[PDB]
């Protein structure tokens, strides 16, 4: 949920203005409005569970869904689910940048966890793929000015 520098590349950083500027600041909050898009065939089914936490938790944490969470499901011909997390899901503003090595055990900055609440099921080979885009930060608060931190981390991608 630290989102300055932008995208990671092997030996480089990828950049777009709306990020350039964000990174001009140091600390940030607001309401984060995410846009989840299905990119696989309406025949590949899954119910995806979204929430907000920290990185210290193990993947076998039975207990997350006892967190504010929102369950997403796509209608056959439905491809866009807009997701809104309110500013009340965060206590204090977080850092705009965190060094790229910062171990999932040292992030003090909030993360956006996505999970399978059931299963991925189909009757055709396929992998469920949904893309997430942070459309607007609403009712923002930016306390600071970022001198900068070299590069940034990677972001998912892959075949098909």
């Amino acid at each position: 949920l630290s989102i300055g520098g932008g995208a990671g590349a092997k030996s480089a950083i990828l950049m777009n203005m709306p990020n350039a500027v964000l990174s001009m600041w140091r600390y940030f909050v607001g309401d984060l409005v995410f846009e989840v898009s299905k990119m696989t065939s309406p025949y590949i089914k899954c119910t995806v569970s979204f929430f907000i936490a920290f990185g210290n938790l193990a993947d076998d944490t039975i207990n997350f869904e006892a967190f504010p969470h929102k369950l997403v499901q796509f209608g056959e011909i439905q491809e866009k689910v807009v997701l809104k997390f309110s500013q009340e899901e965060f206590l204090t503003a977080w850092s705009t940048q965190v060094r790229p090595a910062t171990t999932l055990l040292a992030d003090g900055c909030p993360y956006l966890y996505a999970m399978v609440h059931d299963s991925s099921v189909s009757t055709i080979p396929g992998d469920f793929v949904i893309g997430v885009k942070l459309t607007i930060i609403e009712n923002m608060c930016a306390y600071g000015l970022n001198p900068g931190i070299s590069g940034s981390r990677l972001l998912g991608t892959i075949p098909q």
Partner: peptide
């Protein structure tokens, strides 16, 4: 990040 308050090298907002 607190209300515009900072703490020495705390892990809170890195």
């Amino acid at each position: 990040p607190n209300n515009g308050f900072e703490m020495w090298s705390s892990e809170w907002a890195n």
